[PDB]
Paper text:
All three paralogues share similar structural properties as homodimeric proteins, with each subunit containing five transmembrane helices and an extended extracellular domain, which mediates the bulk of subunit interactions. Here we identify APOE as an interaction partner of the paralogue TTYH2 in endosomal compartments.
To facilitate this process for the ubiquitously expressed paralogue TTYH2, we screened nanobodies from synthetic libraries (termed sybodies)25 against the purified protein. These efforts enabled the isolation of two sybody binders that selectively targeted human TTYH2: Sb1TTYH2 (short Sb1) and Sb2TTYH2 (short Sb2). Analyses of cryogenic electron microscopy (cryo-EM) structures of complexes of TTYH2 with Sb1 or Sb2 revealed clear densities that were attributed to the sybodies. The sybody formed contacts with both subunits of the TTYH2 dimer at epitopes located in a region with poor sequence conservation. To this end, immobilized Sb1 was used to pull down overexpressed TTYH2 in cell-derived membrane vesicles, and then structural characterization by cryo-EM was performed. In this reconstruction, discernible density at the intracellular side seemed to correspond to the mobile C-terminal part of TTYH2, which folds up in the membrane environment or in the presence of an unknown interaction partner. Together, our results show that TTYH2 in native membranes can be recognized by a binder that was selected against the detergent-solubilized form of TTYH2.
Numbering used by the authors:
A (entry chain C): 1 to 114
B (entry chain A), C (entry chain B): 6 to 73, 88 to 416
Write the structure that this text describes.
């Protein structure tokens, strides 16, 4: 029993800033396991960022390092992704996921860079 | 350490065991069977028969001597009588040592089984009842905070899993009762038997010394009562040899294949895997309890992770219910200590050492004391027969 | 169960300790210091002085009687000799039982310590080498990990934590070496002493038989050889009384407080926390191994769940290092087995039972055997003196 709500997606211009919020209801955010994924229309779903449960240790892929920061908002039960210095190939459907067994990936938040 | 049958058990077990009709009967230990009982009373009656033959020899020789060297043989009879008392003292002491070793091993098994059962009951009650009460309190205070109620339901589910996997363990209530009954019966029989044999040895030494006293000097009229007491102790010694031989044969038939007998006695009360695990330690194999203990410890670790995170990530949002969250963590770590103790009690070595000690005790010490008591009975019968058949000896005129 | 303080140990410890020149000494077990050896040498010299006084009194009384019912007294002395031989057999059997029990308890403690060391060394080696090799292989084959290398890094971290905790466990190599040396010395000394005392029993029986044979016929050469051997045998009996009394005093005054002595000796060999846990079994208290075993269990559970997640979520993705991931899963299952085999051998129960059994062998049965052996030596000396007293009337009468 768990549900996923993604918010903040929209159409942006190259090099702006935006924050995506992936709401959680059945697993506490950054408390068991957290994960963020993306997928282009024709492509395979790809990892971008992740959070480890307790120590707030975060890692980012090579092509995305130093530009996005993903946070832990325990106050409102939400995970944020802070995207900075956007580039056009960052246009894809974004998701968050977990690998615990409470459930799986939810739905998408469309982010397009022009 | 390992158990193997020593030579004397093999020698005694090979002794024939037949019924009153001389029919061969399965020699496997089974006291419930009437046929095995009749087989051992067959040896009892054989001992009675040779006792009767020996008395017939005494009466015939006495009447032959009366109707129709000597003092050295009388002194020798006294000496072998004293040696018999000494050997019997040693044998009775060894048999008592074996019986007390068996009682101590049974008591150790009782304590280790009662510890397992007490830990099982305490952990089950603690977890289920107290954790559910506390968790209801947290759900009361943590209301309208979703993820916290989900984690609360998660720890409740893990508690249910712990309860199931912990109840899925043997419950040694009837086994504890059987061990207690065996210990009390062994204590009663052993104490009364030791008293009886000590009295017999005292009477043997007394009659030997006081019968030699008459032969020595002073009054000679004692010899009539000395003869009467010697005959009484002679028949008593024959009965003692009968009983000792029967008990030794039964104990040897038990000791040749003790594992099979124990495994086929505890067939319904105890599971087969558990008994085969305790009797034969599975150093190469896998402990049957391993899966349940693994699930127990995995669930406890998950509880500890969730509760520690809750303590660290719920002070600002609520600032309350931490007074019993510390309590639930204390309960969990006490249960962790209980788990360590439980996996230290269900280990094969703990009960296996007690069982091997009981086996060594019974077989080695008890049955060597038994054949030594039989040897005492044999020497006592020999010396008694010689001193009774020493003759009137002019009635010491 | 706790080692209750017995009574004869207290009585034998209550004897004054003087050493060499009337100094009160200490009467607290302290091997390897001058005062204790001086006290033991005092006791030995006391029995030597008693032997010398007995010899001088016997010679002087014999000369006085010569210069100035006896057969019955000689026979009584022979009977006392036989009874002393029997009681010496009992005492030697009890002493050998105690020595073998001590050796067996030390052997079982050695086995448990060797098992603990083998388990800790095996788990640390297996982890630090094979497990690190497997994550090294899996990390490189996993390309552009990101999410995955975090889990792999945490697995490596927590494996480091568990290996550090296991390194924190005491290493018992020196203790098992010392136990092996003590067991070997005990076996060698006990075997030689048992053989020597059996030879002494044989000598006593043989000399008593020769005395009884020579009492029948007044033969001068037989009497002379018999007396020459009897004086020698009585000097050995007195010397045996000396050694046995010294050893009994030492064992008794070690018995009055064994825990403090075994704690004093083990001041650098083993940390005081472990020894105070093993000697007492404070079942209502904590355990020094609780924290390291808890961390081991938590590490193993968490690595289990993480590796299971990676295995069940990576085969659909990569399916290339699957043999490696099954290998680490197998290593983790094996570490679970060794953990369940480890948290039971470090427990208080096994080593405390070993210690109590060793104490009972050395203190209950062992000291009883030594007291019986000293009583045998005293009885043999008395019987030999009584027999010698009949010597002057053995010649010409
Ligand atoms: C075997 O262990 C059991 C543990 O249950 C002991 O039972 C206790 O016995 C005492 C008297 O000795 C009673 O006062 C207790 O109430 C009993 N406890 C329980 C839980 O029933 C039993 O005594 C032990 N038996 C032997 C022979 O050692
Ligand atoms: C959980 O059980 C353990 C038993 O040792 C306790 O662990 C201690 O926890 C405190 C508080 O975090 C630490 O400062 C100590 O270092 C820990 N002790 C050791 C020996 O490592 C813990 O207190 C128990 N939980 C509760 C609520 O009592
Ligand atoms: C005490 O335990 C040690 C454990 O090392 C035993 O040493 C082993 O002894 C056997 C023969 O008994 C040898 O085959 C092994 O090679 C020895 N192992 C090592 C590592 O040296 C020792 O024998 C035990 N002592 C007693 C009296 O049981
Ligand atoms: C480690 O232990 C488990 C449990 O014994 C082994 O088998 C697993 O068992 C569970 C419960 O039946 C199954 O759900 C799993 O699918 C089993 N795992 C398999 C078949 O890979 C497990 O195999 C062991 N690991 C290794 C490497 O042998
Ligand atoms: C005794 O019982 C065993 C049980 O296995 C059986 O095989 C055997 O034939 C029986 N009889 C004898 C004489 O051993
Ligand atoms: C041995 O086990 C069998 C199993 O069927 C059982 O029927 C039999 O009664 C048992 N007998 C003895 C003597 O233990
Ligand atoms: C023995 O010495 C200790 C100190 O080592 C002292 O406390 C004690 O009084 C002394 N005397 C005894 C035990 O008779
Ligand atoms: C034994 O240890 C105690 C306590 O540390 C100490 O006082 C004493 O000197 C040590 N040695 C002896 C021989 O008692």
């Amino acid at each position: 029993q768990v549900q996923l709500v993604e918010s903040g997606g929209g159409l942006v211009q190259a090099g702006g800033s935006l924050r995506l919020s992936c709401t959680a209801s059945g697993f506490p955010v950054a408390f068991a396991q957290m994960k963020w994924y993306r997928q282009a229309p024709g492509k395979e779903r790809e990892w971008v960022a992740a959070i480890w449960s307790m120590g707030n240790e975060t890692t980012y892929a090579d092509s995305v390092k130093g530009r996005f920061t993903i946070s832990r908002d325990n106050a409102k039960n939400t995970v944020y992704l802070q995207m900075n210095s956007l580039k056009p190939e960052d246009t894809a459907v974004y998701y968050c996921a977990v690998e615990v067994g409470y459930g799986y990936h939810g739905q998408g938040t469309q982010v397009t860079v022009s | 350490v390992d158990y193997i049958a020593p030579w004397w058990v093999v020698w005694l077990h090979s002794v024939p065991h037949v019924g009153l009709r001389l029919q061969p009967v399965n020699s496997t230990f089974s006291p419930g069977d009437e046929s095995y009982q009749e087989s051992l009373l067959f040896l009892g009656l054989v001992a009675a028969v040779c006792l009767g033959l020996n008395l017939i020899f005494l009466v015939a020789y006495l009447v032959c001597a009366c109707h129709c060297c000597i003092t050295w043989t009388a002194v020798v009879a006294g000496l072998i009588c004293c040696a018999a008392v000494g050997v019997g003292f040693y044998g009775n002491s060894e048999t008592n040592d074996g019986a007390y070793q068996l009682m101590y091993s049974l008591d150790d098994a009782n304590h280790t089984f009662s510890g397992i059962d007490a830990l099982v009951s305490g952990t089950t009650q603690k977890m289920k009842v107290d954790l559910e009460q506390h968790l209801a309190r947290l759900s009361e205070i943590f209301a309208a905070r979703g993820d916290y109620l989900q984690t609360l339901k998660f720890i409740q589910q893990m508690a249910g899993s712990v309860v199931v996997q912990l109840s899925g363990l043997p419950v040694w209530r009837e086994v504890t009762m059987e061990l207690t009954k065996l210990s009390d019966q062994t204590g009663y029989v052993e104490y009364y038997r030791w008293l009886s044999y000590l009295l017999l040895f005292i009477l043997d030494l007394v009659i030997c010394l006081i019968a030699c006293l008459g032969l020595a000097k002073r009054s000679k009229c004692l010899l009539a009562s000395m003869l009467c007491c010697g005959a009484l102790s002679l028949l008593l010694s024959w009965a003692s040899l009968a009983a000792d031989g029967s008990a030794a044969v039964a104990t040897s038939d038990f000791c040749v294949a003790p594992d099979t007998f124990i495994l086929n006695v505890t067939e319904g009360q105890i599971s087969t895997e558990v008994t085969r695990y305790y009797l034969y330690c599975s150093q190469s194999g896998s402990s049957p309890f391993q899966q349940t203990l693994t699930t127990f410890q995995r669930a406890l670790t998950t509880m500890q992770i969730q509760v520690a995170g809750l303590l660290q990530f719920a002070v600002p949002l609520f600032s309350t219910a931490e007074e019993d969250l510390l309590a639930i963590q204390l309960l969990l770590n006490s249960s962790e200590s209980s788990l360590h103790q439980l996996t230290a009690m269900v280990d094969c070595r703990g009960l296996h050492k007690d069982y091997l000690d009981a086996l060594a005790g019974i077989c080695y010490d008890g049955l060597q004391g038994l054949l030594y008591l039989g040897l005492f009975s044999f020497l006592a019968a020999l010396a008694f027969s010689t001193m009774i058949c020493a003759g009137p000896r002019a009635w010491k005129h």
